[model samples]
Target chain A: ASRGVNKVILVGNLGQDPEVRYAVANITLATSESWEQTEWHRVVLFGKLAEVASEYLRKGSQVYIEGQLRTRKWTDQSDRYTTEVVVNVGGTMQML
Target chain B: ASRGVNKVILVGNLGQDPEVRYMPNGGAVANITLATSESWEQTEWHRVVLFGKLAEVASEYLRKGSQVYIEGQLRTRKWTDQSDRYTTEVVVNVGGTMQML
Candidate 1:
C-alpha cells in the first residue's frame, strides 16, 4: 500500500554538504541548463534515506533521487505564510 | 536552462478521472492515476499531481484511458495502513512536463 502514490525523481549535483540535523533534512542539488547556467533545489530526506545521503554525498556529486513531493506550511513572525515544497525521498538515490 | 536536476518520465493511460481539491492552507491540487503497461501482462499504477491552473487544465483535458507521455520529477511520501503499519509511496509533481504522446 502507498500514501497516495507520492513520489519524485531528481538528477543533479549536490549544492553543498548534507545538512544532517533534522528527522527530515535538506539536500541542496543543482540541476544544469547550459555550461554557465544551473538551478538549485532544496530536497528533503527522511529515515534510512537521510542517513545514507549524509554519508555518501558531497558538493557537486552528481546523483539520482527518487522520492515524493510535499509542501510544508508554517506561520512566520509577522503572520505571513511560509510554504516550502520539499521532496520526501523514499525510493532510492544512485550516485552518478 | 534548468533547475537542479529533477525529472521523471512515464508513458501510460489515465486510470480514472482526476480529483481536484483544495489545499488546507491554500490553492488547489489535482490527483490522477496512470497505468503503465509493458506487455499487458502487468500494469503499474503511478500517481501524478498538478497545482492550481495546471490542475484545472488537467481536469479539462485528461480523462479515463487518455494516452499520455508524462515527464516529471519522482517524489515519495508515506502513510499508515491497517493495523498501524506504515507505508511509503512514490509520485510525480507535474509542474514540469511535455505531457504529450
Candidate 2:
C-alpha cells in the first residue's frame, strides 16, 4: 500500500578526481570506482555537498556514502537518447 | 590511497516487475527501481541492477510490490541532452537480495 524505497552504503577509494559541473545555480560532482576487477561505478553528487566533494576530495581517497539512486532519460543533440543512474547524496564521512 | 568500491543497501517494494535483459556472455542483467525514505516522510528513488544468482533469484521470485532488501554499487552513464548538455547518473550494482518477510 506504501511506495517502494531504495538505499545503498559503500566504502571504497575514489578512482579519480571529482569532476564538478555548474548548472542552474547548483553544482554536480562526478566520480568513478573500481568496485571489482572488471566493474567500475560512476557516482554523482549535487547541491552543497557537491561543493564539499569538489573542494576536499581527491582520487584514491577512501570514504563512506549514504544515498538513494535516481535515473533520468533525455534526448541527445544527435537525436540519441540515454538513461543514467545518480545518487542523491544524503550524508558522507571520510574514512582513512 | 587504495582503489575504492561503492555499495548500497535498500529495503523497499518493487516499483515494477523485473526487466531481465540477457548479455552476450552466459551472464545476464536485470533491473528494477526502488523507493527509499529519509526519516518517514522524505522519499527518494533508486535504480537497481542484479547479476549472477541474485539476478536469477530476483527474476524468479520478485514481483511488483514485493518488499526486498538489496545491496549494490552506484553507477553512472553519460549522454548528451537535447539542450546539448552532458548528463550523468548513479545506479546500484546489486550484490544481495532478500525478501523482507
Candidate 3:
C-alpha cells in the first residue's frame, strides 16, 4: 500500500478559519522564523480529518500536522502547480 | 531561534550525482535530485540541498541511484531571473540529518 516516504510535518498558527467543501477542508497555516520571516502553507484534509479540522480548529489556532506532501497540477488561464500537505488515511493532527 | 516546526522527510533514490559547491569560507554545499517512488506516474522529484559537514559527506558518498533518507526543512527562495517567481527547496542545515541507504 506504500511506496516511499514523502512526509511533511508542520506546527504553526492558522492564518484563517478552515474552509469546508462537503467532506473536505482546507487550511492555511503561517509559520515564522526567529528573524521574523513568515512562510504560509496549504493543507488539505479528508473524511474524519476534515471533520475534526472543521469543528475544532479556528483562526490563529496553533496546531501540529503530519501528512504527505503532494503536488497537484491544474489549469485555468495557464498551467500551474501547487504543493500541499494532504491529511488522509495515514496522517494525523494535534491542537498545540 | 525558531518559532514553530517546519519539517520534511524524504526517502528516495538519487536522480544524478551530487553537485558540490564551495563558499569563500571553504564551506561545502551539496545539491541533489531525488525521486520518491518506483512508478513513473507516482514518482515525485525533489530538490534537496545540504550544507556544512553534511554537504561534504553527501558529495563524497552519494551517487546516482543511491537511496537516501533526508530530514530537513522547506525553504522557498525568491528567484531573481524572473519576476514574481519563487523556488521551493528542502534545506538540510546544521540540525538536519541525512542517511545513505
Candidate 2 whole-model C-alpha lDDT, 0 to 1 = 0.56
- Tens-digit per-residue lDDT, A37-87, candidate 2: 433444566676677777777875666665545444456455332332244
What TM-score would each prediction reach against the true structure? Answer: 0.50, 0.57, 0.85
> How big an interface RMSD has model 2?
5.8
Interface root-mean-square deviation, each candidate: 9.6, 5.8, 3.1
What pairs collide in candidate 3? none
Position A51, candidate 1: lDDT: 79
Q: What lDDT tens digits, residue by residue, belong to model 1 across residues B1-101? A: 45446565566677898788878876677887776543314345666787776677777888887776666654333355452222122234435652544
Off by over 4 Å in 1: A1-5, A34-37, A79-90, B1-5, B8-101
* Backbone N/Cα/C clashes per model: 21, 18, 0
Of 1 and 2, the candidate ahead on DockQ is: 2
Chain B global fold similarity (TM-score) for predicted model 2 against the true chain B: 0.71
Q: Name the better of 1 and 3 by DockQ.
A: 3
Q: DockQ for every model, please.
A: 0.18, 0.30, 0.52
C-alpha RMSD for every candidate: 10.8, 5.9, 2.6
Off by over 4 Å in 3: A1-3, B23-27, B38-41, B80-83
Winner on DockQ (2 vs 3)? 3
lDDT per residue for candidate 3 within B1-101, as digits (tens), equals 35568899999888999999987887788999878864425777888999888898898899999999999988777655542445678899846899998
Model 3 CAPRI quality: medium
